[PDB]
């Protein structure tokens, strides 16, 4: 029984020896070919010609593929607004036009680079500003509204308003997108090995493009070297392209992207623009709020509607606000389609909330912790979308974080450091977070498992979820072992496949451990029941004895298992019914030191208290907290995507795009899980951990802002109660320029 124990990831040893297999590590067939995408170099244009005569001179060349070669349908994507291959008109810089097939990936690269495309340019929309003035949106306004806004504002002592921007983010999974497709030659049958979180849609999209029933297509997924949401839908761009090449040539075909191709083509996180207005009292008490959110969605819908929904559901953070209107819009632009990324619109809305909050504190001239606390929900409150908060544990998390970080003592030091230092400053901030657990789409909250026990008493488990490093399989093996009461060494999970568990939701929303844990648990119970009579007949025998007597007596040792989350179903009219099963909570405190003369900064220390109920594995869970947080610190400080005026991406590798490194992390890094707080609502009283922590990296962002304020008080003006604009990410350019002094001027 290992549930609650720090068991290392089950594949870790083989990951450290290079023996674990990823998609491109699978050996090739003797006749196996290679694919390389041919991609647009224009934001928005008519395709006037495609010339392949030069590509034909390359040795090993097999063929060029385009929209004409497709037997089934060139209509694709989650809302069917995408092409597999563009026909007459391209709609962003990395848009897919065709593909080249050759005998080596070197030959493929060389032939693709040499394909000539002729364009005639069309006027383009790139920015959010461009989309608003040209009125370029998918679907219509989204809204949530509670209380009375007039009245709220009419009784407010003060008002503050402004505008905030938050840049996007590339996933930078260490392993890029990757598919192998093997055609059988019978009846349209095809088997695919793919790096994806969504074996289900991969199977659907391939079969649609082929013109063939879904039952001909097998999709198998052993592991991913990272996913982070970028492999929930966008992996089908490579997948379908490769399938078609296998269909057409009759040979096995593969493709792994180069980094520069991955960042251009497959999409990132949505950038957000916000326009806000808050009304409050002299005490700092909030009394009315109004926010219009605009996201940059790119050249297709994909997941953009759901991401906007989760953002609106999160515009409150941990704060009770009696009169509130949030709206949201999705900008239709000529850039690669943006998609899921860890947090899913939650960090954007949460960041917008903490920004006006920090401006209320400064406008009132009160300390920040105090203004944040006065305004918190209390046990049993309803949210702006009328859901009850039960087992609301932010007050605990807050309290222990203040104590073990020594917040007030260290605050004195910071002021002291600022009084004695001229061209260097320090900042210190403390931030709460809540995160709703469930797909906002009620029908995705379903999960299946399939378990066999063989006659040697060894057990094969298979469920709808995939491994991407988060330790899902490790956790399911812990679950099964406890449920069946046999050691983990008797249980194995091999892979995820559409022919063992059908119709499964993408591995996403942080709910996988909850839902597949439950489905695996039901399959175990059924096995225990069927084994019961044999246990009674031989009370002093062993697992192996009971299994072999059940087998000889013709009792089946195979069963499915299923789970469906109860009581979910929020309505945008009525403004009611649960959107989430429960909430995950935490608190982070961070300290930084800036160099006012260069824009550089150091992360001195960070403390986190996170509530994960009773952990199934503290080591995996603490690992999930540190990973998520460091990716958030990347989003808010280091990482930046930068385009040409014509809409072409400049940042395409590790040397122009800086994700956190070994020396990026806070010199003193401390994480605790909160104790004694079981969750009634999920497997063995645990809680979802994957996405909730990422937003806490913002505590580094607001510690930096606090330090810009003291630099500004030193060299610029005497208005303590001054507001200035700081967008995300706070790069060194943004930090230095904000430190207005005798040189900037």
């Amino acid at each position: 029984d290992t549930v609650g124990r720090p068991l290392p990831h089950l594949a870790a040893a083989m990951q450290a020896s290079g023996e674990a297999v990823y998609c491109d590590d699978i050996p090739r067939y003797e006749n196996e070919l290679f694919l390389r995408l041919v991609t647009s170099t224009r934001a928005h244009a008519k395709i006037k010609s495609i010339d392949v005569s030069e590509a034909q001179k390359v040795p090993g060349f097999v063929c060029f593929l385009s929209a004409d070669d497709i037997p089934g349908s060139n209509e694709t994507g989650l809302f069917n607004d995408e092409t597999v291959f563009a026909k007459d008109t391209v709609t962003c810089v990395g848009h897919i036009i065709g593909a080249v097939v050759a005998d080596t990936p070197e030959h493929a690269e060389r032939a693709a680079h040499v394909v000539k495309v002729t364009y005639e340019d069309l006027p383009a929309i790139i920015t959010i500003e461009d989309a608003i003035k040209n009125n370029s949106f998918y679907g219509s306004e989204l809204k949530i509204e509670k209380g009375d806004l007039k009245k709220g504002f009419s009784e407010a002592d003060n008002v503050v308003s402004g505008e905030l921007y938050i840049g996007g983010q590339d996933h930078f999974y260490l392993e890029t997108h990757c598919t192998i497709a093997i055609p059988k030659g019978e009846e349209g049958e095809m088997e695919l090995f793919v790096s994806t979180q969504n074996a289900m849609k991969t199977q659907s999209f391939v079969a649609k493009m082929l013109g063939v029933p879904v039952n001909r297509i097998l999709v198998r997924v052993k592991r991913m070297g990272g996913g982070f949401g970028g492999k929930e839908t966008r992996s089908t761009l490579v997948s379908v392209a490769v399938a078609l090449a296998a269909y057409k040539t009759g040979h096995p075909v593969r493709c792994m992207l180069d980094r520069n191709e991955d960042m251009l083509i497959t999409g990132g996180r949505h950038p957000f623009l916000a326009r806000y207005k808050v009304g409050f009292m002299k005490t700092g008490t909030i009394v009315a709020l109004e926010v219009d959110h605009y996201s940059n969605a790119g050249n297709s819908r994909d997941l953009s509607h759901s991401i906007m929904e989760r953002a609106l559901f999160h515009m409150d953070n941990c704060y009770k606000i009696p009169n509130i209107r949030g709206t949201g819009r999705l900008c239709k632009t000529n850039l690669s389609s943006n998609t899921a990324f860890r947090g899913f619109g939650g960090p954007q809305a949460l960041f917008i909330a903490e920004n006006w909050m920090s401006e209320v504190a400064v406008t009132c001239g009160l300390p920040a912790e105090e203004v944040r606390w006065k305004n918190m929900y209390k046990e049993g409150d309803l949210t702006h979308f009328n859901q009850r908060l039960e087992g609301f544990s932010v007050p605990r998390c807050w309290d222990e974080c203040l104590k073990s970080s020594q917040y007030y003592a260290r605050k004195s030091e910071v002021d002291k450091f600022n009084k004695e230092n001229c061209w260097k400053k320090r900042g210190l901030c403390i931030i709460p977070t809540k995160f709703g657990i469930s797909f906002t789409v009620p029908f995705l909250n379903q999960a299946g498992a399939l378990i066999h026990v063989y006659t040697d008493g060894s057990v094969l488990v298979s469920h709808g979820g995939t491994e991407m490093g988060q330790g899902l399989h490790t956790k399911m093996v812990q679950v099964a072992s406890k449920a069946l009461k046999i050691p983990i060494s008797k249980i194995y999970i091999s892979e995820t496949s559409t022919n063992t568990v059908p119709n499964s939701s993408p591995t996403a929303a942080s709910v996988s451990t909850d839902i597949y844990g439950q489905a695996v648990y039901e399959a175990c119970q059924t096995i225990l029941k069927r084994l019961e009579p044999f246990k009674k007949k031989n009370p002093d025998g062993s697992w192996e004895d009971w299994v072999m007597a059940a087998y000889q007596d013709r009792v089946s040792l195979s069963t499915t298992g299923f789970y469906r989350t109860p009581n979910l179903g929020y309505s945008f009219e009525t403004n009611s019914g649960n959107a989430f099963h429960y909430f995950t909570y935490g608190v982070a405190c961070s300290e930084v030191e800036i160099d006012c003369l260069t824009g550089d900064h150091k992360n001195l220390r960070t403390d986190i208290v996170m509530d994960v109920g009773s952990s199934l594995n503290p080591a995996i869970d603490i690992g999930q907290v540190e990973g998520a947080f460091v990716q958030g610190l990347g989003l808010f400080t280091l990482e930046e995507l930068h385009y040409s005026p014509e809409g072409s991406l400049h940042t395409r590798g590790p040397s122009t795009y800086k994700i956190p490194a070994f020396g990026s992390i806070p010199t003193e890094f401390r994480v605790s899980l909160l104790r004694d707080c079981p969750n009634k609502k999920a497997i063995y009283a645990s809680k979802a951990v994957g996405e909730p922590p990422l937003f806490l990296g913002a505590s580094v962002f607001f510690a930096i802002k606090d330090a810009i304020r003291a630099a500004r008080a030193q060299h610029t003006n005497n208005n303590t109660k001054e507001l200035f604009r700081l967008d995300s990410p706070a790069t060194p350019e943004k930090i230095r320029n904000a430190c207005v002094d005798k040189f900037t001027t």
Binding site: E19, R259, N260, P660, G663
Partner: protein, 164 residues
Amino acid sequence: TADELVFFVNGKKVVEKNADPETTLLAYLRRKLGLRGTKLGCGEGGCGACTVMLSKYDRLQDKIIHFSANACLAPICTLHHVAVTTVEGIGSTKTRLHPVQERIAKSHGSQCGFCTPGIVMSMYTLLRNQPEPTVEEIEDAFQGNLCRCTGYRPILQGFRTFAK
């Protein structure tokens, strides 16, 4: 009319009779010799997923030197009479793990696992040059190694066990 290229990979001799000057070491290990431990992360020298150890006898210095290197940028043509060590060269779950491998695994320093071979070969290079390094030397051996899962704490904590 073309010379043979002769080098060593994990202590075993490789005699390439038809070397192409454009061929990367990374491509040679994965696609010619079938050793997929070493990984492609970027192709432009910044991620280290492709780190290997190189060994040669220095005709000048008189010594054997061991240094780390990016397989994605090393042309096989610069390697005549060089020795290559990859992750599969230092230990295996089939025989026995090297301490570098053991420690990173058991300290939760590997999650998705794609950057682990490269970090393992950076630590191992450091140990072969300096059997008892300082904490400071340890942090520094990793400037060219990126990891997107762990946030780094557990990898340093696990390797710091080799210091003083």
